[PDB]
Amino acid sequence: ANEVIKCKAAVAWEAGKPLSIEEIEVAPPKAHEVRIKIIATAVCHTDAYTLSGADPEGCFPVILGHEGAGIVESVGEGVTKLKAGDTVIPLYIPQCGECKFCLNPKTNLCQKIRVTQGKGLMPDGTSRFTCKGKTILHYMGTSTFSEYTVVADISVAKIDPLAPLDKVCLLGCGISTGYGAAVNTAKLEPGSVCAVFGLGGVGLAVIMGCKVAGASRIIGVDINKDKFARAKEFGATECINPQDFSKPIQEVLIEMTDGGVDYSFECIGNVKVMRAALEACHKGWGVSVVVGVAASGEEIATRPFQLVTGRTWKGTAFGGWKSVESVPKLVSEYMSKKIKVDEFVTHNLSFDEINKAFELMHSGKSIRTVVKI
Amino acid sequence: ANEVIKCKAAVAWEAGKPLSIEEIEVAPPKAHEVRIKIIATAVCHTDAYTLSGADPEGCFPVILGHEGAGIVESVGEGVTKLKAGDTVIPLYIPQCGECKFCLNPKTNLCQKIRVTQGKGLMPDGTSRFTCKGKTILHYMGTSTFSEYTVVADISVAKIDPLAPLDKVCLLGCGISTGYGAAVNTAKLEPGSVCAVFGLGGVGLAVIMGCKVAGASRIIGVDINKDKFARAKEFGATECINPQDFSKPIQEVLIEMTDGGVDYSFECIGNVKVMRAALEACHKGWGVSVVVGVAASGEEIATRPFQLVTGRTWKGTAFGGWKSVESVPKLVSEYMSKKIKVDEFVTHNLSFDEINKAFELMHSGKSIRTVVKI
Ligand SMILES: NC(=O)c1ccc[n+]([C@@H]2O[C@H](COP(=O)([O-])OP(=O)(O)OC[C@H]3O[C@@H](n4cnc5c(N)ncnc54)[C@H](O)[C@@H]3O)[C@@H](O)[C@H]2O)c1
Ligand SMILES: NC(=O)c1ccc[n+]([C@@H]2O[C@H](COP(=O)([O-])OP(=O)(O)OC[C@H]3O[C@@H](n4cnc5c(N)ncnc54)[C@H](O)[C@@H]3O)[C@@H](O)[C@H]2O)c1
Ligand SMILES: CCCCCCCCCCCC(=O)O
Ligand SMILES: CCCCCCCCCCCC(=O)O
Ligand SMILES: [K+]
Ligand SMILES: [K+]
Ligand SMILES: [Zn+2]
Ligand SMILES: [Zn+2]
């Protein structure tokens, strides 16, 4: 029988405060739920955004984390596709395969459990986390900052049992998104001229995707020149710092590409840079893809003339990958050396030092920090 | 030998005043130029905007008009594809077929003569119009408000001699644009749910295109309910007036379609409605195409969230048709009865009554007025 598990977890008691390593209780999985033992997890800007209290959708107390990889500890009633021991990756974008969205080839945004997930609850409307007598909320349907988490069965990707979990946990978000933005959303053709704004883990994954697709030019853009070396290693043909120019970055890109790039990607979350990314696109056929998540309230803008004269403005969520069916394949692409993963890991920490990952992220000195549970 | 031609034309001496029927001189065609005898010309809000004086690029004196059909009166040196007698349609969007744009399948925006055309001049930098001792400027590279006009040899579509010129003159603008917006820019699939904002000639052509593509639902939107009857005749499954609802129009549409439309088309030129059109699109795969030409300086806006969650913002110019090769085919589709043209004509006038065409536009009681030269 599946019992209540007593384990450690990094709890976010309140907005604006660091995470606290607490002893918590994890209820057994109910019908169509899966309990997972998290082996490794990474931290992303989104976890920090929610933690800051700036996220109008954020609620506390809560167990954050959405970039993890683990092993199935037990499954609830009705679950047959998964079993104890399976190697998996929690998914914040599920795939029920039955809804209006899963049935449509043009999207990956399953809506089956979005309502409850937004409230930090399981599909049945309750939470499996408790701590010191209080209910602790789930986050993005994953809550990877715990030794053991419980997710909806449609929020799980079964992967290659040989994949090193302290590496593939990154496919839970950043890598997959940037890579998918290039090959799924933009679908850039061989020989394309591209520009990538923001050279963090996401931008690097975009560059990686542009190289896989055979781009002829990949121009990285970042105000932090320390990001350049790794950008080139990933495939950037050149990097520029908007701070070195006196004219708008879009004019610079237009100037160095004889009209503008074929595809641009904003991987920062700056509405002003998003406009520049669109305007840096070549007249007639340029396509700009928004990947960054802007603070709530912020709006993007430009003159309709930009679209009338040929440019297209797109966006992407988790690289457009239908999660459950795609993630296993991304793991296989990693195992076969088609895509990189290890190269995104810049720092490693133990669970007790989880807050240092947030510090490294804000010091701007890391791409991705993997936390060993 | 080609001599100077004295003829009648509707001259716009200054902004904010009615066109003046004058006698003018039309120089012969220089190298790579074609002089055309205009048989019929229509009028649309773009001609009126320039005349209003609100166009930051409107210069006077000028001979307006960009919707025409006629016969080649004579050609200049080096012109061998066209000859006197050919039936043709002048094009404000040329097709040199040799520039980077004409060679790229994703666009129809030939740039070979845009600079001079924008200055109301032929490619050689001069004008062929004179009147009362004053040089008169060309307009949109067509100047169809004259018995005779001269245009670049790459601004000409050779069409079926049997086509009725007082009809196909509308294919030089509105009809082609709306139709193309649906089948070239949107490329909507059979069964698509569509919304068309603005039911003028452009919107009706979009509806016509949606029907040809096999759209399942076509919702027409306009603040003037008198535009509804004809919209339904063209294929709209229903029409709604934004004024009849207290909620923003995009909220009404989302409600009416269980999520939003698959494709929306803005055929007005109102940035606020352009935003509504985008937000009225369905999450995950919705696509909005801006067809309307907004006033200078105005800009469109929305929250990047809209793009990140699946929507796409596009625009179109002359329906994306590579002008020289497409117009003849569009004429053929009309001849074959695949598309409508005659149904767009709401009024007919003689050349001397040309100003009345503008009066009809202001009263909002016309789609297209055809002026017989
Ligand atoms: N759409 C999605 O599904 C999805 C998925 C994951 C992440 N994201 C978003 O992607 C964005 C990037 O994630 P990340 O982990 O790579 O973040 P990151 O902070 O590590 O990288 C962002 C980079 O932007 C650079 N930058 C900041 N201002 C700049 C400017 N004005 N011009 C050029 N560069 C500038 C920074 O130096 C940094 O290197 C974030 O907004 C994240 O929330 C979106
Ligand atoms: N992109 C192109 O290549 C291209 C080509 C031709 C025309 N255009 C532009 O297309 C637009 C329309 O051309 P047209 O000939 O059909 O003009 P039109 O005036 O005949 O049509 C405009 C319609 O929009 C309706 N309308 C006005 N405000 C509205 C609102 N708030 N909500 C709903 N409907 C509203 C008007 O009542 C009218 O029925 C103009 O901007 C024109 O310049 C663009
Ligand atoms: C770590 C980055 C995660 C941010 C995810 C961005 C994806 C937005 C889609 C969520 C909205 C929806 O599913 O209806
Ligand atoms: C009849 C009015 C239509 C006016 C056309 C609007 C399209 C503007 C695009 C300009 C073309 C270019 O810059 O190459
Ligand atoms: K593509
Ligand atoms: K399409
Ligand atoms: Zn992340
Ligand atoms: Zn689903």
Ligand SMILES: [Zn+2]
């Ligand atoms: Zn017109």
Ligand SMILES: [Zn+2]
């Ligand atoms: Zn050209």
